[PDB]
Amino acid sequence: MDMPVDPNEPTYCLCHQVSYGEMIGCDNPDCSIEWFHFACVGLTTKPRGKWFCPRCSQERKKK
Ligand SMILES: [Zn+2]
Ligand SMILES: [Zn+2]
CATH of the domain at 17: 3.30.40.10
| 15 assigned to a ligand binding site | yes
Counting runs of H as helices and runs of E as strands, what totals does the chain give?
A: 0, 2
**40-53 b/e with 16+ CB inside 10 Å = b?**
bbeeeeeeeeebbb
Is residue 24 within 8 A of residue 51, CB to CB? The reply is: yes
Distances (CA, A) of 41 to 2, 6, 8, 53: 23, 27, 27, 7
**Nearest bound ligand to CA 15?**
1
| Structural method | NMR
Q: Check residue 60 and report its DSSP letter.
A: T
Query: For 5, how many CA atoms within 13 A lie in the half-sphere containing its CB?
Result: 7
Beta-sheet pairing, 36-37 with 23-24: antiparallel
**Nearest bound ligand to CA 18?**
1
Is residue 26 within 8 A of residue 51, CB to CB? The reply is: yes
37 phi/psi in degrees, rounded to 5: -75, 150
Domain total in the chain: 1
Range of 45's domain?
Answer: 1-63
